[PDB]
Amino acid sequence: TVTYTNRVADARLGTFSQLLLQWKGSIYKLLYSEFLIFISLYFAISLVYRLILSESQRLMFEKLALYCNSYAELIPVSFVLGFYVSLVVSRWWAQYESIPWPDRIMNLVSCNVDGEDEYGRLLRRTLMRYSNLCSVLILRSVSTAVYKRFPSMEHVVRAGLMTPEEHKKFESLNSPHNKFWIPCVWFSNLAVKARNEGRIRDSVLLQGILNELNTLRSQCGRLYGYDWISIPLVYTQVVTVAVYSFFLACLIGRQFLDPEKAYPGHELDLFVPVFTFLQFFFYAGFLKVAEQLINPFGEDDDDFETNWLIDRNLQVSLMAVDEMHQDLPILEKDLYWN
Amino acid sequence: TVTYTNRVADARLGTFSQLLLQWKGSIYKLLYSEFLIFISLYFAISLVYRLILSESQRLMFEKLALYCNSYAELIPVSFVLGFYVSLVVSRWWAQYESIPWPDRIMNLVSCNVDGEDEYGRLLRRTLMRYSNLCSVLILRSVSTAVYKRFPSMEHVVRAGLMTPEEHKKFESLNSPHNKFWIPCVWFSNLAVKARNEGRIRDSVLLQGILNELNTLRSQCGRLYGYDWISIPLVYTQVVTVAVYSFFLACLIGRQFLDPEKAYPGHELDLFVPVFTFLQFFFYAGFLKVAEQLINPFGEDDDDFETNWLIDRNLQVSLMAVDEMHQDLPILEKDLYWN
Amino acid sequence: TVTYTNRVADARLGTFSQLLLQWKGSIYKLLYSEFLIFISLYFAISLVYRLILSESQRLMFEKLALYCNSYAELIPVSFVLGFYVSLVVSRWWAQYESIPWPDRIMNLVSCNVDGEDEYGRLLRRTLMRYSNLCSVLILRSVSTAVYKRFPSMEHVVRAGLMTPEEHKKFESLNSPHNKFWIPCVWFSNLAVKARNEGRIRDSVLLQGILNELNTLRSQCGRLYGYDWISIPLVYTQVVTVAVYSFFLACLIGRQFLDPEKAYPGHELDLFVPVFTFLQFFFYAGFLKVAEQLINPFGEDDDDFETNWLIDRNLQVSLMAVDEMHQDLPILEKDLYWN
Amino acid sequence: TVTYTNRVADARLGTFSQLLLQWKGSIYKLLYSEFLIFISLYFAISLVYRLILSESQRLMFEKLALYCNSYAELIPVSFVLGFYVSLVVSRWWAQYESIPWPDRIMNLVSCNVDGEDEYGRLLRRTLMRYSNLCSVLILRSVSTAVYKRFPSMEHVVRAGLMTPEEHKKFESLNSPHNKFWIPCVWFSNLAVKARNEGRIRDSVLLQGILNELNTLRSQCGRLYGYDWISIPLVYTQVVTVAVYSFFLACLIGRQFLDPEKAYPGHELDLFVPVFTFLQFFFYAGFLKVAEQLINPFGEDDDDFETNWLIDRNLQVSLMAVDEMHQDLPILEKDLYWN
Amino acid sequence: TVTYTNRVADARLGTFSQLLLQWKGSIYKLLYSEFLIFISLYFAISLVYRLILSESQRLMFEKLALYCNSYAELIPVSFVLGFYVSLVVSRWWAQYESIPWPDRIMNLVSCNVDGEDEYGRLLRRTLMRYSNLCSVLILRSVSTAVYKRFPSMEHVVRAGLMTPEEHKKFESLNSPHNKFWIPCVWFSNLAVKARNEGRIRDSVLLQGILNELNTLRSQCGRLYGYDWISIPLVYTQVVTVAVYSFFLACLIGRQFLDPEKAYPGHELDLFVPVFTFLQFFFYAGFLKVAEQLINPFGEDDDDFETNWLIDRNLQVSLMAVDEMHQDLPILEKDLYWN
Ligand SMILES: [Ca+2]
Ligand SMILES: [Ca+2]
Ligand SMILES: [Ca+2]
Ligand SMILES: [Ca+2]
Ligand SMILES: [Ca+2]
């Protein structure tokens, strides 16, 4: 993502005017190919009308340019595109909230799984590695940025997310479906094995760990839902005809006609339609935003930084359950005491 | 469903343009019958006006075509259809989230119901088979795709979802209503029977299993609500008059009139109304999407794959509580240790 | 309600066209009285203009018909009605979800309240009868269909929902307010009395029963909120002026004027305004839907079937805690065993 | 509030027509002062134009009346007011749901805090009086109807909500902020003192009481949020200019001009603009609803009855924990037994 | 924020009219710089047209002023700005609800962590200081008003939020990411250390404290999400072109043209466009509100008072766990006893 929240904290004059000079994650990078096609297709039809057509054939073009100008308003562009951008944005923030974070499990494994010896130290690191693995295996199913980092399961073993003894157990489990649910079952069987050896004290503390596992399992199930149940293809096909047929009609209808013929409306020749090129900037602008946010786990400039977030969650989890288990600072009287 | 999320991860040029060449789950398959009726009804009236009507009778058609062109805008098509598509889409994603998943019960039965012998192995499989049966019995009430797979309760016994001793107990329970709540009561009575025999250790662990049963019972109750409390029939009848009466008026009003009579607006004859056939493509396009998504448990190309999801949930549940009970991989020091 | 979900599972041709031939719960039953008043008021003014007014007085009517046609568009009908139908529909589904269901309490009372003797059998039936009574007493406050079934509290005793010893205790409790909260306090005092006699085993199992009581108490509190805090009367009065003053102006403005006077727009006489009668069908159509759904607990054809649902909840509750307490089917090896 | 839900249960003919004859809580009471100013300002300008201006000065008024009629449509009244009424209504129902109800705490204190002697009777009444006091102290901060009933804290002691020994402890606690959180801390310290004396049996039953305290603490925190974080003043100032500048332009632009001058549009003189006075009825109608619902805790006719609800919650709470502690009706076989 | 909720409790006449005379947090302070640029750019073009252009060059300006007046309506200002203000407002209230409050942890630490001696007094103050520190460290990442108060971590030690022994432990923990999660791990390790020393009685009471820690950890994670995942920059760049290009066209198109040339529409010269300056007041008015609310943690007049709220939460937390631990008022019979 491109974060600019620190720049728009106040509102003085050029609050948004300094943001339209930025290239990365901008409207100017998204529309740059579709704009130059629309400019070149416009100026081709303009130069053919002004140089190539004969006098008996220019008048045939003038009748089509007035027909296509009057009846292109029958294409309900704002109705069709306005409904579609509401679907993409409603699903956009709902998929950020479905990204699992280890920090609620991390608080409970760091304190309730006892032991400063090398076995309880191994037992807390394996729990938080199973919680991170249950999240990597769903992100490499829903994100093309995570999948290009981990193309095969051998790449997951090389990153330290999975030991080689766990890869043999992960392949011997024969299932034709997606196996992202495997480490979330290894977690709950290891947390019960930890209790039966005396590492977790009570069953109220065990069930509190198992409740945060199922919360993270529900987070992974939502990411599986938004990847599998797409926006309906019948909606995507309607909105790409509504935008493209509207500006296909604007290549004919928005031509500057001959002022000597004195048509109503076409009384001035300027050679560049500024208000048509602006109207392409907004109608095809919102279509290109919807193309970007329909899958926010790709490799756009403003998609979600999921390769970053895997690196954060692995380092923070194994820091809080290993280096921060009973390492507390000394209890001290603060500034306000009596 | 037709999933295309992997194809629209980035936004380069033809992000949505490559999706309008696909036939399965498309707008071209839905509108194919209504479009050819509207084309043929249009060209019939056009050829009757141009070949059959006399000169004193064409002028009567010209007056009706101008009346029906001016006052067909009194039909509030975008207001009526825009409200209706908001209802169908708001209920659409809310019914996907009501589909029950076994995976939260599956995590707790796989670890808390003890025993590696043949009785505790039988006890965990029967719990997860009652959770899957409490979901099949509501899906064959709300889905016509599941009902055509399981037309009678004898088909459920042949699929292994119900033993023949449970079908006798399911028929002896005399109730005139829907019996989808029966296996969710058998679950809670078997989980308490499991605790009283020592298989479940504490009552905190029993109540954690019973809380995930009632969460899955609330999921089945939402699917019962959306099937029984439909979108009101008075809304469905208004929107199918608003779309059909609008394009019934466009069979007369959008005719190409005689250019020799020099009417305002009808100065060009093209024999094919491109902007009327496009306007049918969007207004009757959104009506056909709403016809598809009003019951997303049918047999459309973009309805929910519920026969697939029953086969997934049965195989994954009986895998995690039978083959994955205490089968953990060996605890190993990972890549980051010291 | 009128359920048609089984008929619109697929979308072939006449998916919604077969639904506009149905009378029960239709737009044709709601608008039948307001339409015939609007037709008869229109044709009265039309026949008075064509037969009764003199030539010097018809020209006074022609000036008012052109004034009322041009400036009736100042009435913001779609803005006022479009906001109001959003309020009625947003509250409509939120009141279905507030209807309490016994099935989460029913799962926990059927398993955790022990005893096969006649006292534990009496103790489970009294708990589930207090949960159903705490729901009947709020439905007969919010529904006129339940109130006409149970006009007095003596009718509740005759239906078996309340024993005569409980009616004496229900009247001796002196409170000037609504007493729907009485059986939800009798539930929690009987569940603690059940634990202190050894019928409920632990306090974790007691608190799980008491948590589902307070969830059902929160359901009854939402039904009390939507009945008491109505849609504001100032909104209901504005929308019934916006629809009725608009079509009061259409009785004058949509008259067919004299074609011999050659007014702009009134060049054709057809004696029946098809696009005005259609415009009454949608603007007064959505007003009549909002009149139906503003209280979905009445006796309309598409209001909620609450007398049915009380009969379901009483039979299902006393079936699962009496006939299904420890009556489990025999544990059997299923089809997939080895 | 003005409740009319019992009157609109069905939809026959005059479902909403009988509601426009009611004065209390109506649009006719809200707009009565702004309407008579707008009528009198209109008829003053009309009588000055028809009686006072000279013939060379009436023509200057005719040019301004045509300028102000054409360009008053540049004021986006429906866009500005339609966004603002969505904010007021979205916050309106969310503040009713934030009003705390004692009935979930009331169910648990009435059963789990043991003792029929005068000390356990005193202990249950003090808990439910602290829960009601933690709600009165936030309602007299957010409601002007509760504050005029309890202007000082001495008025709270006179109503029985606070004993005089608790007022000394409430003043000795020195805090410069709002002290609505004080009785919610006294509750949790008294519930633990009740457990340490043996009145509450287990810690699972103690934590269930403390969880419903924090739910009621979260309800009071939401009422503190909506009172402190208002709708932004920049929104309130824009919408009161958009409505008032629009009808300031309608005092000039909607005048009936001279028919002898034959302006386009002003061909009929009627002396009363019915469609301008109706347009004031809806645009300034929705502004006056938003003025009423922006603080629903005031003293309007359709604000929330919070003085009523305090009197209900105090009587119902002290009834269920004192007169209904172990007072159960006799267990009896119901109508359906064998 | 600017609170005016106490002033709009009722709705009499000048309910909103008395609020448009206020300067702080007003539309007049936000638009004051952009308005004077738009006025001065308008009157410069007006005085150049009336004094500097020649007669053959004024007619060239008249043709551009009619072109830019007719086709500036192609810029979809209400569609582009209306979608953007819905995003800013939807995120606005969702970030107020993400601000963490200590009061649910404060209720449970004040009662369940035993001890009146100087060690249990030190133990409760350190828990509530870790909960407040876990909130300050995320607010100084998301707010520029908190960051200017605490620029470095040495400023946090000087305010009493962190003892100097905790700053050494906070720096020795080597992490390249944001460290707001550190005190929320110190909390859970100190609450378990408190239980193992006998200060917290049971594990049900420990897990209740740890559940409110993870609720406050989820609040801090939402504030991290809204700061990091901004509104997409491609949306911010489109709306600042849609507003600025529209009123760049209104500097030419809304000029008062020559009345002697008798153009359609430009028949009156008034030298001040009142309805253009009003149209700038609303379209650029809503843009400046969106500039203010896109980061509500800055230093605007109507941003969130977060430096105030830190001072409240620190004083209230250390008051309820130190001065209010077992300091209860005397149990007294209230006004309603027999
Ligand atoms: Ca993307
Ligand atoms: Ca379907
Ligand atoms: Ca009704
Ligand atoms: Ca008010
Ligand atoms: Ca700001």
Residue numbers in the entry:
A (entry chain B), B (entry chain A), C (entry chain E), D (entry chain D), E (entry chain C): 2 to 339
Task: Tell me, in the authors' exact words, what the paper reports.
BEST1-4 proteins are expressed in the plasma membrane and form Ca2+-activated Cl- channels by assembling as pentamers. The diameter of the pore varies along its length and contains two constrictions, the ‘neck’ and the ‘aperture’, both of which are lined by hydrophobic amino acids. To address these questions we determined a series of cryo-electron microscopy (cryo-EM) structures of chicken BEST1 with and without Ca2+ in activated, deactivated, and inactivated states that represent the major gating transitions of the channel.
Because of its location and the conformational changes it undergoes, we hypothesized that W287 might propagate conformational changes in the Ca2+ clasp to the neck and thereby govern the conformation of the neck. We find that the W287F mutation (BEST1345 W287F) produces channels with dramatically altered gating. Whilst BEST1345 W287F retained normal Cl- versus K+ selectivity, the W287F mutation constitutively activates the channel, making it nearly insensitive to the presence or absence of Ca2+. To understand the molecular basis of this behavior, we determined cryo-EM structures of BEST1345 W287F in the presence and absence of Ca2+ at 2.7 Å and 3.0 Å resolutions, respectively. In the presence of Ca2+, BEST1345 W287F adopts an open conformation that is essentially indistinguishable from the open conformation observed for BEST1345 (Cα RMSD = 0.2 Å). Unlike BEST1345, 3D classification of the BEST1345 W287F dataset did not reveal a closed conformation, which indicates that essentially all of the particles are in an open conformation and that the open state is preferential for this mutant. Thus, in accord with the electrophysiological recordings, the W287F mutation decouples Ca2+ binding from the conformational changes in the neck that are observed for the wild type channel. Modeling of the W287F mutation on a closed conformation of the channel introduces a void behind the neck, which we hypothesize energetically disfavors the closed conformation.
